[PDB]
Design a protein around this nucleic acid. Sequence first.
RNA 1: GGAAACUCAAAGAGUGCUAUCGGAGUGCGCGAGAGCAUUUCCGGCAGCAGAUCAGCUGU
Lengths: 377, 461, 166, 482, 103
Amino acid sequence: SKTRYYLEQCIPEMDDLVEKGLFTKNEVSLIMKKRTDFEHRLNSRGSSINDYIKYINYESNVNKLRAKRCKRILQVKKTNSLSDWSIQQRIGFIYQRGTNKFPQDLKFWAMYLNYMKARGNQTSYKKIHNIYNQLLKLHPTNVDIWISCAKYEYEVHANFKSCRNIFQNGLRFNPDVPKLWYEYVKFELNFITKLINRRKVMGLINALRGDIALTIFDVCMKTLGKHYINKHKGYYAISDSKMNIELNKETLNYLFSESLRYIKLFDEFLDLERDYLINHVLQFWKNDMYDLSLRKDLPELYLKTVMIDITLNIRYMPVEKLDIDQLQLSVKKYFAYISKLDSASVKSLKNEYRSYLQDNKMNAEDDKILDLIISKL
Amino acid sequence: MKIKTIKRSADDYVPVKSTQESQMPRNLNPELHPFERAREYTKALNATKLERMFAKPFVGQLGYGHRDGVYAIAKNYGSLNKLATGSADGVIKYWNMSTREEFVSFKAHYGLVTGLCVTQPRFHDKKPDLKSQNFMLSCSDDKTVKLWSINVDDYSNKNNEEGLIRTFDGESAFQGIDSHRENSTFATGGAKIHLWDVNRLKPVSDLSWGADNITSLKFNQNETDILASTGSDNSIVLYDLRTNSPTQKIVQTMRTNAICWNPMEAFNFVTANEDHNAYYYDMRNLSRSLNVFKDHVSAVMDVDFSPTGDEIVTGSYDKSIRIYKTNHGHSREIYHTKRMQHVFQVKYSMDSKYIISGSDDGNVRLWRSKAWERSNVKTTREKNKLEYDEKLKERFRHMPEIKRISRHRHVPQVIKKAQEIKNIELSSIKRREANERRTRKDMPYISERKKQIVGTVHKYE
Amino acid sequence: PIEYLLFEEPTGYAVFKVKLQQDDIGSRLKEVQEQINDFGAFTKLIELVSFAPFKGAAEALENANDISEGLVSESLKAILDLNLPKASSKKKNITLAISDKNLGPSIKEEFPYVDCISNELAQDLIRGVRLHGEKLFKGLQSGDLERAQLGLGHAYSRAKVKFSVQ
Amino acid sequence: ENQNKFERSQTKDKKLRAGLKKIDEQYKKAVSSAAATDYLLPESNGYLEPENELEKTFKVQQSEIKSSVDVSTANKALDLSLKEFGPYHIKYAKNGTHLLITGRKGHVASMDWRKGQLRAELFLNETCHSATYLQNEQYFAVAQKKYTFIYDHEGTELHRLKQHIEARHLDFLPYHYLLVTAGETGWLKYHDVSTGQLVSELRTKAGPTMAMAQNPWNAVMHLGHSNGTVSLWSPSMPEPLVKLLSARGPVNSIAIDRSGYYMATTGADRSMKIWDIRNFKQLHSVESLPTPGTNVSISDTGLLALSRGPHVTLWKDALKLSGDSKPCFGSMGGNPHRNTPYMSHLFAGNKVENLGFVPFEDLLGVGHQTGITNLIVPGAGEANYDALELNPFETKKQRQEQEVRTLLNKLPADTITLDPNSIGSVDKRSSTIRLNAKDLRSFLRKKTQNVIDERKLRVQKQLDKEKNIRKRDVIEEALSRF
Amino acid sequence: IVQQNRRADHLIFPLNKPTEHNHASAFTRTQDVPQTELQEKVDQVLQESNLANPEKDSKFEELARTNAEGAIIVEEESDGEPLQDGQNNQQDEEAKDVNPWLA
RNA sequence: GGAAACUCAAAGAGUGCUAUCGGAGUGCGCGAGAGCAUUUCCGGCAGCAGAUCAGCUGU
C-alpha cells in the first residue's frame, strides 16, 4: 500500500512530540489511530473532498492543541524542534494531494489559497505563484481566478507590472466577459490615482492622463460587440437584412448598457480629468458603429447621450451657485439641442427639469430662473 | 482494582462504507514473523524460476534485412531510435527502429562497405540543420568515403537534398572510420590512419607509427580529442589529436578486431580480438589488462559498452552473442538463434536495454539485454515486487541450487561440445604446466591479466 | 523528448504534460501497445495540465476551420503562450507533440522556442488520449463531447459546402 | 528502548571495509526504523493491577471481571456446555477466528465462536483423541480411533490416512504445510498436506509419546516421553535432534512460547520445570504443587497457565532469568519477592482436559468434562496482530489469496534445523583466510583401463611422497659417508 | 570524478544538470513583444510615462519625533504608496541598517 | 416434479478503482534557481504603534 507509507512518514513528529513531554503515549496513539482511519478514507477507492476538508480540520485543530499545550506545559512558544513545522508541512501535502486528485472545486482551491496566504510569513509567495499558476492553467475560463489573485498581487505586493501582465493575459484568454474588462479599467484607474497621489506627495514634501483607460475602453467596446454578435448567430451567419440590422440594434443596446455602467462606476471614481474621459466616451458614442444610431433606432439612447452631454457639469457641486454661474453653458447647449429635437425635446425638458429639481443670488436672477430665485431667496 | 481488556471495536478494522479499503494493521515483530531467512530464500528461488519462465529475449527483426550480411552498424548518439547499417554489396541503410522500417537506401559503393558512423557535421558556411535531416558517412575499400544526408521525420518543423552530400576520395583503400563527436572531425583507417574534416577534400593529417594497415578505430565518448585503433600487426595504438600524434602502442598475441571505449570511465576500453576473450584495458597503465572476459569458443568479432557504463555486449565469430558485466569476468548470459550465422557487429542502443546484433545472414536482429524485464511502464507495487525479488536473487546468488537454476541455458550443441573439448585441453595444459613447475626453479607465476601482452613501447615510468 | 502534448477537442483545447516517457525502441510490441488501450497505465503516462474551452459556437467553428486548413488562431496561440515554458538556450528548446505536419511549421513560425513533433509516438499518444476521452479531463468541463461534435460537424460541413439556406 | 525485540544477532581491502560499514549501518538504520513502528501500533495491551496491598490479583473472579469488562468481550466469554459426549478438547485456529472442539466419545465440531456459525458438526462412534486446523476454516484434522482423518469445511470426510497407525498427539507446521503425528506406538511421522506425500517416519525408540508441543520459531517438534526425556525432532535426522531430562517418570505436558525461547514442562511427579531452549539451561523448578498438573499452556505475552484438573492457575511474567519470578503459590512471612498466581479459577468437580489461549483476544479457552469455558484474562493475548500473515477479519478473496501465496512460499521440509537462521552460512569449510589458488576385446579395454588407473595411482603416490620430502660418535663421524 | 562515481550507492542517470526550467508563469511576458492589439496600444501609450522604479526610488528615498508620533499618518502614506521593488529594497536596506545597529 | 434466494458455504466468468532545518541574507549559478550551507536578521521576550502583519525600543 501507500497509506502505510504516508503513516510511516508521519512518525518522527510524534516521536519528538512524546520525547518532549507535551503528549503522552495514550493520547498520541489515539491521534495516530484517528489519523490512520482518516488517511485510509483519504486514499480509498473513490474518496471525497469532504473527507479532505475534515481531515484538514483535524490537523489544524491538533496544531492548535499542540500550540496550546506548548504554551501551557513548556511555557515557550516555539520549541525549535521537528514538532512545529511538521503539521503545517502535512497540511501543505494534503492540500497539494487534494488539488491533484480533485481539480474542479474552487471551494477547495480557495481554501488552499487562503491557508497559504495566511502562512505567507513562514512560506513566502513562491508557493503562492506556483499553485496560482497551476490554478490558472487548469481553469483559464473562470474570470474570478484572474480577478482574485490580481487583487492579491495589487493589495498585498502591489507589483503593477505583473498586475497589468496578468490582466492582459486573462483579457487575451477570454475577451467576451464584461466583468474582466470593467475591473481592468478599475485597476488601471487605481494605479493612475496612486501615481498621481505619489506626485502630490512629492509636491507636499516640496502625458499620464486616462488614455490607458480610454484605449482599453475602445478595445472593450469593439471586442465585446463582436463577441456578443458571435455569441448570437451560433454557427451560421444569419443573412437577411432586417434581422442583421435588428441584431446590430440589439448589440448597440447591450454595448451602451455596458458603457453607462462604465460612466457610473467612473463617476464614483472620478478625482481626475473626469469630463475629459467622459467626453471621450460620448465622442465615441457620437461616432457610432454598424448603424450611426443618432437618426436611426434607439432615439431614447440618443436622448440619454444628449442628457449626459448637457448635464456633464452639474453632477459635482453642493454649492449650486457655481452651477447657476456656469449654467449658461448648460442651458446654451440645451437650447442648441432643443432647436434640433421635437418630442425628445419634451422628454429632455422633463429630464432637465427633474435634474434642476434635484439640484434645488445675483447669478440666480441674471444667468429655470424661477427655481434659481426660489433657491436664492 | 483496575481492569481492562483490548477493544477490537469493529470500526477501525472493518470499514464503515463498502468501497473504502480495509485496514492492514501492522506489527513488525520478529516474534510474529518467525522464519525470516528461509522465507526470503524461497522467494529468491521462486524469483529465479520465474526469471527462467520469462526469459524471452528476442524482440524482432527490422525490415527484410539486407542483401548479403551486415559488416558495419552505427548507432547514433543524439536520438534513440535511429540506426545505420552498412552491408556487404555496398548497401547502406538508415533505419527508424520505432516502426522497424528503413528511411532510405543507397547503393553506396562498389566493393565491400567497411565502416560507417553518423555525424552532426558543423559546416562553417551553413547552419547545422540537424533537427530536420540527419547525416551519416561511410567508407569502403574502393578508396571512397562518402558523406550523406538523410531526410528524417523525427520533427515536423519544416515545409530535397536527399543523398550524397559529398565524397572524400583517398589514395589507398579505407578500412574503418569513426567521427570525433565534437567540431566535425572524423578519422579513418586504411593503409595508415588519416584525419579529415568536412571542409576539405584532402586529408588534414596522417598519423601512423609505421607503414602498417589499421583494421579499426574508435574515438572516445568524453575527453574526445584522444582515440584508439587496432592494426593487423596485432597491435593496439592510441593517438592524441591535441598533440596530433600517436602516443603509445602495445602488441598482443593475436589481432584485435574491435575496440570500444567506456562512456562513463573515459580511460577504460574493451578490446575484442581473435583469441577468444575480450580484454579490458586501463589506458594510463597499459601493462596489465585489468580484466579479461573469457567465455567464447571462436573469434570475438565485436564488443560494445552499454551507455549505463557497466555491461558489455559481445558478438562472436561463432554464431552467438554474450552479455557480460564489467565487474565479473565471465558470461552473465548468452543469446543465439538457429537463423543467425556469424554475428559481426553488436551495439547497445542508447536506451541501455536493447542490443542490436547484426548477423552474416543479412538480418539486423534486436534483443532485450535483460531477457526478462519487459518494457511497459509498470505500476508501483509491481515495480516494487520486481526490484525486491531481483535484489533477493542478487543477495542469494551463491546458493548452489539457485545457482544451478540461474546458470544453465540451452547453449547450442556446437558451442557446447567445442567449449567442452576446449576445457579439457586447458585442464591438460594446466596439468603439464604444473609438472614443469614441479621441476623447474625459475618459473614466474605468469598472471592471467598479463598473459597476452608481448610488448609495450614506453616501457615503464 | 516529448514532454508536452497538444490535443484539440470540440469543446476546447487541451495541453498535457508528459510525466514519464514511452518506450521508443519497443513501440510496436504487444505489451506496450496494450498500455495505450487500458486506462490504469495511461494516466501513469499523461496528466492534464491545461484545458481552455472556447465557449462561443462560432469561435469553435472558426478554430476548427483554422486547424482544418492548418493555421494558428487566437485561443491556440493564447494557451501555448500561457503553458509552454521559455526553455532557455543553455538547456534546450521545448518540444510539443502535435498531431500533424501541416500544423507544425505554423507554430514553429510563431513560437521560436517550441519545437513540434509528430512521429508515431506522438501519433499513438494522441490516439490514446482520443480513446480515453472524457476520463482524462477529470471534470474540468460542462458538457459532453459527442453532441458538441455533432453540432460542430454539421456547421463545418455547411461552411465547406457554402450551402444556400434560402 | 525497544530494540532488543527487533535485534537480529580490521580488514585490509578498502572497498570491502566501506561495504562492511555500509551493510552494518543499513542494519542499524533498519532496526531503528523497524523499532519506531510501535508508536504506530494500533492499540495497547490489557492489565489488571492490584493498586493496593489487600487487593491481591488472584482474589478476582469471573463475576467482577465480567461486570467491569466490555460487553463485546463479555459476550465473547462463551460456555458451549455439552454433556452427552465426553470430556471435551480445544483447538483454536492459527488466527483467532474458528474453534475446533473434540469430545472423547465421538463429537467433533468446527465452528465460528464470535459468530454463531456452526459450519461443520459431525458425530462419530469412536474415541476422537484431539483435533486441529490445517491452514484455514477449510481443512481440519482429527486424530480418531486408529486412523487420522482430515475433513472439509462442511463435514465431508476428505481423507482417511493409510499411515498413522494410531494417533493421540497431532498438530500442524503452518508455513511448510506439514501435519505432524505422534501416537501410542513409538512413532512420529510427517505428512505434507499439499503434495500429499509422507515426508519421514521417525522411529522414536523411547516408548509412547506422552506429550507434544510445537515450536513456532523453528518448527521443531517437542516430544515428551515416559522416561522424563523431552526430545526435540525434525525430519533431517532420524535420530532425535536433542534430548532433555525434564522431569522424573512421565511428562504429561509441555508448552513453548511463541518466540521459541521458553519451554514449560509439567511431569507426573508433582513437578514443573521452566527451561530455556536456545541455551538448554533449566531455568527454575517448581515443586510442592499438590496434584500433577495435567496440562500447561503459555500465553503470547509470557503469562503461563497450569491446569491441575479442578484448578487453573495463571502466572504473569514467570519467564525471566532471575530467581524472583519463580512461580510460587502463597505469600508467606510478608514476602513481596515471590510470584503468586496472577489469577486462578476453580471449576466445580470436572477435570480440565486441555487449555489454549485465544490468539488475538484477551481470553483463555479451557475444555473439560462438561464442555467449554473461556476465561477473561487481561494480559494473556497479543493485542496487535499483523495483517500480512494472520487476520481475524478475512474475506473469501483474501483467504484464497493467502492460500495461494503460502502455497507458493511453502518452505521445503529440509529447512527446519535447530536454528533457522543457519541456511545462509558457509558449510563448515570456512577458511577465514581463503586459499584462492594464490597463496598455497572388452578384456583388453578393461586391462588398458587398469594400466592407466595404476599409473594415476603411482603418480599420486609420487606427488605425495615428494610433498612429504619437501616439507621435512667420534669414530662414526670419521666413518660416515660410506 | 569517476572514482566517487563508483562509491555512490544509487546512480540516478540524469547525471548532468538537465533541462529544469520553471514553467511560463502568467506574470511574466515570455517573448517580450506585444502579441495582442491591446498590448500594442497599452505599450505604445506607456512608452513615455512609466514608473520603472527610478521615480519610485527617487520619491521613496526619504523614510526622531516624526519617527515616534509626529508623522504618524505621513509615514503610513509613504510606506503605503511605496511600490513593490522600492518596498523590497527599503525592507532590505532598513533590515541591514538594523542589523548594523542591533546585533 | 415447480422452485420463493430472503438460510448459508465452496468456487467460475463479465463489469467497474488508485500513485511515488522555514522565509531571506551571505560565497554563490544565466530580469534568474531547480541547489551547494549557515552564526548573517533570525526563528529568545515583551511595549509603542497603522487592522494577526509594516517601522522601531532594549535585550
